[PDB]
């Protein structure tokens, strides 16, 4: 239930934070999908986090490790 922050100023729209998030990958890549909500979607060229109320993230670091030009900061402390 952590909080992710995306630096819009250096986001290129690469979409490798959307493809690599394992909560996004739940809908289409799971047998009998449990939850179909998504943290990121690239609207107007930058990654927007729809997870406003910080309910779905799991601090996995797959998205921080994925962005090619580090731009996603993961906060492990309560918002």
């Amino acid at each position: 239930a952590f909080a992710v922050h995306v630096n819009m100023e250096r986001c290129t729209g690469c979409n490798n934070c959307v493809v690599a998030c394992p909560v996004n990958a739940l809908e289409l890549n799971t047998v009998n999908p449990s939850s179909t909500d998504k943290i990121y979607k690239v609207i107007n060229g930058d990654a927007v986090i729809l997870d406003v109320k910080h309910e779905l993230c799991a601090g996995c670091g797959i998205c921080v490790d994925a962005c090619p030009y580090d731009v996603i900061q993961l906060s492990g402390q309560p918002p």
């Binding site: 239930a1 952590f2 909080a3 690599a20 394992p22 909560v23 990958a25 739940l26 890549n29 799971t30 047998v31 009998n32 449990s34 939850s35 909500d37 109320k53 910080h54 309910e55 779905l56 993230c57 799991a58 601090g59 996995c60 670091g61 797959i62 921080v64 490790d65 993961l74 906060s75 492990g76 402390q77 309560p78 918002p79």
Partner: protein, 386 residues
Amino acid sequence: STLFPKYSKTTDGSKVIMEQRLLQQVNNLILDNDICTGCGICSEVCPEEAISVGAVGGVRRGLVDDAASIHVDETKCSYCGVCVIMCPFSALALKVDGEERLPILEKEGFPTYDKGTAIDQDKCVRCNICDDVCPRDAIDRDVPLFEGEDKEGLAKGQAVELKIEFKVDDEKCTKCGICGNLCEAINVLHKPFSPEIGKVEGEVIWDEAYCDGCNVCAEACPSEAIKVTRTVVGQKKLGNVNIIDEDCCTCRWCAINCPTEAITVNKIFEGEITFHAEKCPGGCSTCVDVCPANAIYLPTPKPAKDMKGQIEAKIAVNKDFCILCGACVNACPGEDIIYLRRDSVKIKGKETDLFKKIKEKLFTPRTSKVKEQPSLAGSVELKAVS
């Protein structure tokens, strides 16, 4: 107001130090963030409900800086030290004044875990497998380091107890340096050359501490002067191998893989963990990355002409090595891929009503969850399975 109950929480390097000042008495709950594994056996056990669990996967992978695996509300903590006794991999310590001091054990008010480690030194053979497989840096092979990777601990030939005899023909020692221009045992000394005799004359000195049955120098002798022999006296066992007991986590990897069955480890927890592979969303090897006992694996994809219509699993576990910690469950971002349930903790020390409560807390089944409540954002909440 009043100031002197000074509550502080400082991140001194890699140790998160949580403190309570007084004039002369302090209280230091120190968490070593390099050893924490993200299990919650410190949050389930906290009598005072202060320890919460944070971004386990990110912290255990190094992608998080402003947090540890666990957050302790040092205003609520009571410095009992139950967390320090009940943490399987000792990554939490209590220091009262300046020394690691556990009053509850000093008064025998709490049982401790019976990891029960031991290495029968009359059976271990100084092998290197147990140090190699042990996931946690906790097996110590006290063994002089022979020619492998270093200068000889004693010598290649003294790693075994052998019996060798070397003899020469002073009648045929031309005193060329070949005998010791090869072995490090043969040292030929040419005593100074004087026209008195007008000849070369010295001595060939052979030391046991460097020989072998190599016998190369027999025929490296231009004149046939040399002889040798060999055999072992029983057993060698140079050094000792034993287990650090405050670091071992009952994985059974070294016991399962020891060549001579000389290691006696018993798992602290008992139960069962199941993986519903069909619910893993693929590229999320967080569970693999955070498992302390490396029980989890990504099942290797088969080659072609061998798949046989069965495609592959996405994740699985080795129940032989799983220690029922819970880091996998705390880290998985999935919904219910993992099912964890512990049935019996193994202890020494008698019992307590508090310990029965803690057993009841540790033994409730749990599984992952997506979309937990926002009011507790910044921590983890699992699913209670009926």
